[PDB]
Scaffold this active site. Sequence first.
Site, PDB file in Angstrom:
ATOM      1  N   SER A   1      -0.548  15.556 -12.148  1.00 56.34           N
ATOM      2  CA  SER A   1      -0.775  15.194 -13.539  1.00 56.34           C
ATOM      3  C   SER A   1      -1.009  16.443 -14.379  1.00 56.34           C
ATOM      4  O   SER A   1      -1.532  17.447 -13.898  1.00 56.34           O
ATOM      5  CB  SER A   1      -1.983  14.262 -13.624  1.00 56.34           C
ATOM      6  OG  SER A   1      -2.339  14.021 -14.969  1.00 56.34           O
TER       7      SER A   1
ATOM      8  N   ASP B   1       0.835  -1.198   0.000  1.00 53.17           N
ATOM      9  CA  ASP B   1       0.000   0.000   0.000  1.00 53.17           C
ATOM     10  C   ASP B   1       0.873   1.252   0.000  1.00 53.17           C
ATOM     11  O   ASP B   1       1.325   1.690   1.063  1.00 53.17           O
ATOM     12  CB  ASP B   1      -0.919  -0.014   1.217  1.00 53.17           C
ATOM     13  CG  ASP B   1      -1.852   1.187   1.274  1.00 53.17           C
ATOM     14  OD1 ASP B   1      -1.956   1.924   0.275  1.00 53.17           O
ATOM     15  OD2 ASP B   1      -2.469   1.388   2.343  1.00 53.17           O
TER      16      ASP B   1
END
EC number: 3.4.23.22
Length: 330
Positions: free
Chosen positions: A199, A35
């Site tokens: 992004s 994770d």
Amino acid sequence: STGSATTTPIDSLDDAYITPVQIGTPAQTLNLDFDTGSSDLWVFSSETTASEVDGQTIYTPSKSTTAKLLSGATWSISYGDGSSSSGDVYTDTVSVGGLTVTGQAVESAKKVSSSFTEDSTIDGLLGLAFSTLNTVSPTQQKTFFDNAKASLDSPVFTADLGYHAPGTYNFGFIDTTAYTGSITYTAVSTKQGFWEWTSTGYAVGSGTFKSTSIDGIADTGTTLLYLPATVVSAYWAQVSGAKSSSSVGGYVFPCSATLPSFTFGVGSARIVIPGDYIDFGPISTGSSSCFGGIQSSAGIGINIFGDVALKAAFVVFNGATTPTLGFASK
């Protein structure tokens, strides 16, 4: 040193991925959910409330000659989906894919919430976010990656998740046979303890690319892709019959649909998520309403590049003094 371990979907939907981890002496092998959105290595154990264990493999520290109680240390964690666990702490030897760390904090669960009990395939979590998020008190502990870093050939790990197939986590090297083209690296902020990056935009299907900054986290422990409501609305508007369902808890779409791809920007590069990766199947057995793999982050407070996005790429988690993230197509 290096390590290399295969990671395997837990089910036919890729709801999560499990990776075998050796703990203790002699080794006890548990299948952990790696994770990159949390920083605790915790396991079902011989200390876990018996009614809360249902098929998981447990760690028994009393059978490990290298286990030592970390005296006074406790831990308690809550995840973005509302699940939680807590307990006490041992140090022991932990190996992943041939890479061994001695003195790793292994957090032994005394209590787990129902979603953990109900998932017999996940024996615990291995956190790979930054150690500043580790929950052990009163002495915060380091992640497996943090402890291994100095020994690694290169201070990196990579995630190569499969679509409905096994994949690989590598530690300490970049397998240049595992991706196509070049790896595009992008800046990371560690200020919230996550692999947080920005992004450069998105496209839906064959549509034109929209240049827009989207701050989010690379999170192997989250199944889906969570993005701003504007972006998610633009995606699902291209699917006939798709709608946001408050009763289901997100966007659903007719199971008869063919989904468009979704592209996200990494600098000047582009990662394409095929439409099929966004299909999470019937909302309930036999239903013709299917659950979408792209969902709004509006209720979270952060955008999450979960498995739906990461499985479309070869992803480098670069833990150099200034961390960065790398993405390549594959």
